[PDB]
Design a protein around this nucleic acid. Structure first.
Ligand code: MG
Ligand code: MG
Ligand code: MG
Ligand code: MG
Ligand code: MG
Ligand code: MG
Ligand code: MG
Ligand code: MG
Ligand code: MG
Ligand code: MG
Ligand code: MG
Ligand code: MG
Ligand code: MG
Ligand code: MG
Ligand code: MG
Ligand code: MG
Ligand code: MG
Ligand code: MG
Ligand code: MG
Ligand code: MG
Ligand code: MG
Ligand code: MG
Ligand code: MG
Ligand code: MG
Ligand code: MG
Ligand code: MG
Ligand code: MG
Ligand code: MG
Ligand code: MG
Ligand code: MG
Ligand code: MG
Ligand code: MG
Ligand code: MG
Ligand code: MG
Ligand code: MG
Ligand code: MG
Ligand code: MG
Ligand code: MG
Ligand code: MG
Ligand code: MG
Ligand code: MG
Ligand code: MG
Ligand code: MG
Ligand code: MG
Ligand code: MG
Ligand code: MG
Ligand code: MG
Ligand code: MG
Ligand code: MG
Ligand code: MG
Ligand code: MG
Ligand code: MG
Ligand code: MG
Ligand code: MG
Ligand code: MG
Ligand code: MG
Ligand code: MG
Ligand code: MG
Ligand code: MG
Ligand code: MG
Ligand code: MG
Ligand code: MG
Ligand code: MG
Ligand code: MG
Ligand code: MG
Ligand code: MG
Ligand code: MG
Ligand code: MG
Ligand code: MG
Ligand code: MG
Ligand code: MG
Ligand code: MG
Ligand code: MG
Ligand code: MG
Ligand code: MG
Ligand code: MG
Ligand code: MG
Ligand code: MG
Ligand code: MG
Ligand code: MG
Ligand code: MG
Ligand code: MG
Ligand code: MG
Ligand code: MG
Ligand code: MG
Ligand code: MG
Ligand code: MG
Ligand code: MG
Ligand code: MG
Ligand code: MG
Ligand code: MG
Ligand code: MG
Ligand code: MG
Ligand code: MG
Ligand code: MG
Ligand code: MG
Ligand code: MG
Ligand code: MG
Ligand code: MG
Ligand code: MG
Ligand code: MG
Ligand code: MG
Ligand code: MG
Ligand code: MG
Ligand code: MG
Ligand code: MG
Ligand code: MG
Ligand code: MG
Ligand code: MG
Ligand code: MG
Ligand code: MG
Ligand code: MG
Ligand code: MG
Ligand code: MG
Ligand code: MG
Ligand code: MG
Ligand code: MG
Ligand code: MG
Ligand code: MG
Ligand code: MG
Ligand code: MG
Ligand code: MG
Ligand code: MG
Ligand code: MG
Ligand code: MG
Ligand code: MG
Ligand code: MG
Ligand code: MG
Ligand code: MG
Ligand code: MG
Ligand code: MG
Ligand code: MG
Lengths: 59, 88
RNA sequence: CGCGGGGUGGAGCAGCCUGGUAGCUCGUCGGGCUCAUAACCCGAAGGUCGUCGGUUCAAAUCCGGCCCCCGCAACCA
RNA sequence: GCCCGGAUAGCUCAGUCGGUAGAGCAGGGGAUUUUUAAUCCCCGUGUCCUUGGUUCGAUUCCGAGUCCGGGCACCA
RNA sequence: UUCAUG
RNA sequence: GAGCCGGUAGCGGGCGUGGAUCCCUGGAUGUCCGAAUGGGGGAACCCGGCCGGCGGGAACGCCGGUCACCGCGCGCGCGGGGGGAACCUGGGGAACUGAAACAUCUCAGUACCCAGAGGAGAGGAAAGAGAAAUCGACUCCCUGAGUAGCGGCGAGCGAAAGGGGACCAGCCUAAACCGUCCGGCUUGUCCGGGCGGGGUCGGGGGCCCUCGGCCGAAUCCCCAGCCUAGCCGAA
RNA sequence: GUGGUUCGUGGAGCCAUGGGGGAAUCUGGGCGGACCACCGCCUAAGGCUAAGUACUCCGGGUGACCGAUAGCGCACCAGUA
RNA sequence: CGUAGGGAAACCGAGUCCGAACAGGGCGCGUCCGCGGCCGUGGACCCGAAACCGGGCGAGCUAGCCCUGGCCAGGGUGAAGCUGGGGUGAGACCCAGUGGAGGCCCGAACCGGUGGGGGAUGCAAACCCCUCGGAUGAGCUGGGGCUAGGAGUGAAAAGCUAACCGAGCCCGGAGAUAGCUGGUUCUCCCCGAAAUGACUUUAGGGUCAGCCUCAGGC
RNA sequence: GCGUAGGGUUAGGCGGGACCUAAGGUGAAGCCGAAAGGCGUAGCCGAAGGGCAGCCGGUUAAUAUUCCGGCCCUUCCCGCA
RNA sequence: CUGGUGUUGGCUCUUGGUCGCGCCUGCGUAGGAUAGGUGGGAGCCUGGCGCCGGUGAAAUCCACCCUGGCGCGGCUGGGGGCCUAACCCUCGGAUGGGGGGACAGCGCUUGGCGGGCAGUUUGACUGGGGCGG
RNA sequence: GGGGCCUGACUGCGAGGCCUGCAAGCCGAGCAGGGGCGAAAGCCGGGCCUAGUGAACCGGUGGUCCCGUGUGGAAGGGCCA
């Protein structure tokens, strides 16, 4: 279960650090606390719609 | 039990045995009684606003797929009907 | 009246294994101790292994069966 | 039927993870000994199950076999 | 410190 | 087409060859109960609200509407609810029996219960069947066959292919892509949500420039014919 | 873990699926009775689809069907007393 | 179906198989009807179980409980208190009075049914008479209600649950099953047994042989 | 008291309902069950319990707290104060 | 009742298989001498020999590494905590507050206990049957 | 009873019988392969004989020129022990 991270968290910290957290950890803490979203292909390209607007558009 | 996105529970036989088993020696059966295998059911709680399901817990990712949505409509107070009929 | 269980030293008992190799406690006898009896200690010894008949090389052992003793039953009417 | 563990004295057992064989009890002898135990000192009843084998020499390692104690399993 | 009786 | 006013027999009372009685079809009225449905209810009864109507009257009355609950779409509207002798599908589902006892088994997925549905239901167009460089939806009947098998290999249960027939038929949808639009946001030349357009082994489709192109519904109005009354019918 | 099919654990495939792990979209995927490799077959995880068939409260006709104890339980005011 | 069978099968074929064997031995050639006897699965000759299971119906009887009402004539014993007195340091305590307590006493209704008698095709599918037990309580009883079949309920007897309860009744499976008992319906003619052996979860049943009949061949 | 026919049951005040609840039903909400359905809050139903306005006399063949005679009382609605 | 997994998570403290890593380990002799098994065997640091000599086997250096143990780490299985977000119970009704808390409840599955319930079996000859045989 | 040599406590069959309700049980000369013993005739397919056992099914184990679910092969079967 991969989640895109949106906040700092201890031992999984950066934004877009798509870490395989446990399913209960995803669907119980991060998903009701906004800290992460599920890394399906559609939400992954929804991440990518911001990655293209941030990473290669600062430069 | 229930269904909410899946099919209802089934009916099993039991089929006891008291034997060695073919790849060792002679086999058998004993008693064919009806275990009634109620399917795995978990009350899941999602935050459409306060919504609750009895989802099959091999379908908890499916109900989170159903929640990862915005079906254009506000609160009548209860509303799992528009979450379950705008299911595929 | 029919099952099953015993019989082994004076008594109470181990037992005895396909049969050949028999004992234990107390009692006993003799001693030692003791003023003397107890108790204790030391030496042994004692038995047709229930009679009987059976196969056996050989029976206490195994097979019957008979006499005393024990435990069981003897119910349905 | 397979699977473990074991065969070390009269008995119950440990084994430097090969270079020395051993306890503990029993037995005997010796010391005290009212009685018997207890205590004390010293010796043994020893092919370390059987052979084959690996090693320089085997209780130890390897296999086979025998008895030996179990564990489960069916059982037509 | 043991140990019963005439 | 001459007798009727039901099963009339009796008051005698009327009514009909200007057409009755009857029969059929279409309406109307259908009290009350019943899915019962305004609420209650011990069915065939009580008690209402709103609107409209009769000092018949403001209070009790009665009339005529409308007032259940659920499902579908935008307060608003179309269905559903129960019944049916069997028939059928699904959810459940025994036991006596038979095995000369019985437990696996059989009886049996039988009876029965529940749901659903309709004149049928079911199933259905292949991720099929299995030996054929094969068959080509599904169902039913006969064969296959008591075969292959399953089986305390007991009792028993028992196909499927093939092959004859009946009947015949194929189709819609995200086998993606383009536009649309309440809002999503980190206003993203973009996430999913509803439609719409695409899409169904000149192996399929979408997208990229040659070579352009109408068969026919299960759907709809029609028409025979069929019924639902009857009629003429020889000597 | 079971049900269905001839299949009762068997060599158990297949079709369904209650539990758990959990993919890819045509050099995909399933099936051809464990399985494996060739050769084939066929496209699951969406739905509809007449016709032929079962039935008989119903209406009609038909009877080597009954003729009032028969035939329905009722030929009659019977699912009645 | 039958024309070819052997073998477990591949397969081979008037042969096949066992085998090394060209020893030996095992096995080696009609249907379709009608009709009849008989058998199989059918309910299978008919009647009859005790029962088993599914679905229902009953707590208007009774058993318990819940709610709400009622009922208990009358006497009698005389508890705690309370009052006064005695007592004592104060008391405990003890007297009299008063009081009216009780799963208290006698006792009607009421509830019940102890012993006897009657009743016995009764008056009655539980009665009548005499006599008894309780009778202010664990009472009785009307109404309204609940609980139901392997379940209720039970101050327990396996009692009660719609007159028969060691698991109600009704319908359905179901024409359950019956190795058992009963019964089996016209006439004539011919022939005519057995009750023995083996084996049986078998001894009253059955399979086979023995005895019997029919037809055919010898 | 049986057969035939005809009469006979009169309520603002009696008992119920246009009032209330108890046990228990039913039951929106909510829960749980394969389906039947099983629960269940509020609510509603639920009665010889609460609440509510009547007593006495006469009359026929039958009714009478109903009919009638007297006296009293209750609700509601309208009008006046 | 109980293990496994599901719902079911977070952060820590500790016990084994491990994959290689390596300062290191092996000691009756004759012998400068903290002695392992088998091979490479002509020296390797800025100060140590190999044939010095004797061994069942010569040593140095360096592997394959055996036997471990020591740590360093991922594939880790465990038992002990603390947390709160699943879940559950709650609270003059709260998107909240507690408390329990990844346990319980519940799903599958393993094994067990299991007359509480159920389906049945409990033979026959038998000088009636049972007992006996 | 003793001594010597050995494995016939063989493999294929088996005419013929006995017996019997079937199933079993029992004897079996003879032929072949291949041996034992003996010079040879012969005898030997267990024991002087009648007891010392067990249908089936389901499995195991060792072989096997048999089947192998499209094909090659395995699984699993058969057959022989
Ligand atoms: Mg079986
Ligand atoms: Mg069964
Ligand atoms: Mg949750
Ligand atoms: Mg003696
Ligand atoms: Mg004596
Ligand atoms: Mg003496
Ligand atoms: Mg008696
Ligand atoms: Mg030893
Ligand atoms: Mg010894
Ligand atoms: Mg050791
Ligand atoms: Mg000691
Ligand atoms: Mg000692
Ligand atoms: Mg010594
Ligand atoms: Mg020695
Ligand atoms: Mg050794
Ligand atoms: Mg050695
Ligand atoms: Mg055994
Ligand atoms: Mg002393
Ligand atoms: Mg003394
Ligand atoms: Mg004396
Ligand atoms: Mg004196
Ligand atoms: Mg008339
Ligand atoms: Mg007209
Ligand atoms: Mg007219
Ligand atoms: Mg008319
Ligand atoms: Mg009108
Ligand atoms: Mg109504
Ligand atoms: Mg109602
Ligand atoms: Mg009414
Ligand atoms: Mg007017
Ligand atoms: Mg008016
Ligand atoms: Mg109305
Ligand atoms: Mg329309
Ligand atoms: Mg309906
Ligand atoms: Mg059965
Ligand atoms: Mg039976
Ligand atoms: Mg039986
Ligand atoms: Mg079946
Ligand atoms: Mg149709
Ligand atoms: Mg369909
Ligand atoms: Mg197709
Ligand atoms: Mg067929
Ligand atoms: Mg066909
Ligand atoms: Mg065909
Ligand atoms: Mg066509
Ligand atoms: Mg959109
Ligand atoms: Mg489209
Ligand atoms: Mg092109
Ligand atoms: Mg037309
Ligand atoms: Mg026409
Ligand atoms: Mg007509
Ligand atoms: Mg005419
Ligand atoms: Mg005429
Ligand atoms: Mg088989
Ligand atoms: Mg490809
Ligand atoms: Mg597939
Ligand atoms: Mg296929
Ligand atoms: Mg497959
Ligand atoms: Mg295949
Ligand atoms: Mg159709
Ligand atoms: Mg047809
Ligand atoms: Mg007719
Ligand atoms: Mg006739
Ligand atoms: Mg006639
Ligand atoms: Mg008649
Ligand atoms: Mg009749
Ligand atoms: Mg007559
Ligand atoms: Mg009638
Ligand atoms: Mg021949
Ligand atoms: Mg015939
Ligand atoms: Mg039964
Ligand atoms: Mg009832
Ligand atoms: Mg009652
Ligand atoms: Mg009682
Ligand atoms: Mg007083
Ligand atoms: Mg009193
Ligand atoms: Mg009293
Ligand atoms: Mg009584
Ligand atoms: Mg009486
Ligand atoms: Mg009395
Ligand atoms: Mg009395
Ligand atoms: Mg008394
Ligand atoms: Mg009294
Ligand atoms: Mg009194
Ligand atoms: Mg009562
Ligand atoms: Mg009542
Ligand atoms: Mg009872
Ligand atoms: Mg009764
Ligand atoms: Mg009984
Ligand atoms: Mg019952
Ligand atoms: Mg019967
Ligand atoms: Mg039946
Ligand atoms: Mg004669
Ligand atoms: Mg018999
Ligand atoms: Mg016969
Ligand atoms: Mg004769
Ligand atoms: Mg004959
Ligand atoms: Mg009269
Ligand atoms: Mg009045
Ligand atoms: Mg009143
Ligand atoms: Mg009214
Ligand atoms: Mg009311
Ligand atoms: Mg209430
Ligand atoms: Mg209810
Ligand atoms: Mg209401
Ligand atoms: Mg009242
Ligand atoms: Mg009242
Ligand atoms: Mg009167
Ligand atoms: Mg009156
Ligand atoms: Mg007054
Ligand atoms: Mg830390
Ligand atoms: Mg080391
Ligand atoms: Mg030397
Ligand atoms: Mg170390
Ligand atoms: Mg450590
Ligand atoms: Mg660790
Ligand atoms: Mg904590
Ligand atoms: Mg809280
Ligand atoms: Mg048990
Ligand atoms: Mg029982
Ligand atoms: Mg039975
Ligand atoms: Mg008997
Ligand atoms: Mg007897
Ligand atoms: Mg000799
Ligand atoms: Mg024979
Ligand atoms: Mg034989
Ligand atoms: Mg014999
Ligand atoms: Mg012999
Ligand atoms: Mg069998
Ligand atoms: Mg195939
Ligand atoms: Mg094949
Ligand atoms: Mg052979």
């Amino acid at each position: 279960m991969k989640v895109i991270l949106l906040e700092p968290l201890e031992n999984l910290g950066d934004v877009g650090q798509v870490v395989d957290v446990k399913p209960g950890y995803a669907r119980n803490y991060l998903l009701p606390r906004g800290l992460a979203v599920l890394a399906t292909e559609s939400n992954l390209k929804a991440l990518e719609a911001r990655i293209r607007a941030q990473a290669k558009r600062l430069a | 039990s229930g269904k909410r996105p899946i099919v209802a529970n089934s009916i099993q036989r039991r089929g006891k045995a008291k034997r060695e088993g073919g790849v060792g020696k002679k086999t058998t059966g004993i008693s064919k009684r009806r275990q009634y295998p109620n399917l795995q059911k978990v009350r899941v709680r999602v935050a459409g606003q306060e919504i609750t399901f009895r989802v099959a817990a091999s379908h908890i990712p499916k109900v989170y797929e159903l929640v990862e949505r915005a079906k254009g409509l506000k609160l009548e107070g209860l509303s799992p009907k528009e979450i379950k009929k705008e299911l595929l």
